[PDB]
């Protein structure tokens, strides 16, 4: 069984395998380490224990060889206490006389899943900027319409049109301080 299963899945084809350059990973949800190994394969290991998180609560999942052909009842689940010391002892009691490597890998996953929940709670409290996507179509539309808007704006024509307009209305004092004498003389004769 187990050694036949491993040869079929570990070396011919598994739909859960991600082939990386330095290591192979496992897409299985029931893998403690997340790697493709002989010891961490949930399919090839008839007795297997893992820790996974459900809506903020970490559970110990265990399966035995005697439930291998009943997929609905294959994995059993217990609640791990929020107290870390009690959670470690819960894994020790439920995994009693299991190999020390399997208890070791379950306690390692409990630490990483506890840190991730801790980091998830601290991220909620903090105020972080929301990432808003960049839309390639709207950027192209606004860049083109902006170019048309800038050309149609005629900024220099409109700036000098208003600046001369407020010179006529005398928004300054008696005579403005920004105008040369000859220009001011031309303004007075023209406007009157």
């Amino acid at each position: 069984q187990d050694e036949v299963i491993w040869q079929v899945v570990g070396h011919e084809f598994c739909s859960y395998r991600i082939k990386g350059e330095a290591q192979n990973f496992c897409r299985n949800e029931y893998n403690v380490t997340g790697l493709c190994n002989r010891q961490s394969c949930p399919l090839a290991n008839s007795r297997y224990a893992t820790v996974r998180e459900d809506n903020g609560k970490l559970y110990l999942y265990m399966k035995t060889i005697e439930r291998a052909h009943f997929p609905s009842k294959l994995w059993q689940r217990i609640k791990l206490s929020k107290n870390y010391a009690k959670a470690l002892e819960q894994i020790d009691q439920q995994l009693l006389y299991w190999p020390g490597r399997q208890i070791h890998r379950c306690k390692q996953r409990l630490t990483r899943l506890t840190q991730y929940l801790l980091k998830a709670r601290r991220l909620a409290l903090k105020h972080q900027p929301a990432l808003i996507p960049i839309k390639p179509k709207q950027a192209h539309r606004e860049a083109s319409r902006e170019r048309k808007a800038l050309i149609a704006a005629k900024l220099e024509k409109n700036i000098e049109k208003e600046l001369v307009k407020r010179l006529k209305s005398g928004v300054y004092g008696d005579q403005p301080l920004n105008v040369n004498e000859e220009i001011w003389n031309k303004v007075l004769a023209a406007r009157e």
Partner: protein
């Protein structure tokens, strides 16, 4: 359309464009190089002089087969010609740019040829070389006293 130069915004530029013009590309490249950067009013006189052979267009890059002339001393060289067909096209384009500036309401006493570029149109053993010509005319940018 869009020209080769980052100017030709509405600000102060008037554009004139000629595509697939039936003139030699190498001759037009020399005429454009001469009148580039020169005032619009002066350019009309220079093109008028060339038509009457009073002035010569110096051929710098495509100088092969261009004889020595005494009218090129203004530009520092002695290889010059008197192209007419190429000058005629540039006269038509400059008038178009001048008319475009006048319609825009631009100040016509400060217009200079800010950018003029000649590109090779598709070739059509007698495949000649038509020309794409684009001209931008803008006012000479000036400074103003800061505060004193």
């Amino acid at each position: 359309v869009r020209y080769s130069a980052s100017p030709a915004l509405e600000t102060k530029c008037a554009k004139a464009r000629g595509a697939y013009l039936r003139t030699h590309f190498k001759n037009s490249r020399e005429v454009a190089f001469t009148i580039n950067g020169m005032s619009l009013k002066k350019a009309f006189i220079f093109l008028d002089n060339v038509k009457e052979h009073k002035q010569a267009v110096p051929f710098r890059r495509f100088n092969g087969g261009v004889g020595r002339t005494a009218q090129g001393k203004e530009f520092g060289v002695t290889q010059a010609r008197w192209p007419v067909k190429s000058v005629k096209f540039f006269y038509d384009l400059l008038k178009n740019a001048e008319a475009n500036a006048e319609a825009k309401g631009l100040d016509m006493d400060k217009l200079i040829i800010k950018h003029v570029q000649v590109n090779a149109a598709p070739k059509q053993a007698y495949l000649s070389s038509p020309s794409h010509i684009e001209i931008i005319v803008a006012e000479e940018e000036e400074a103003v006293p800061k505060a004193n």
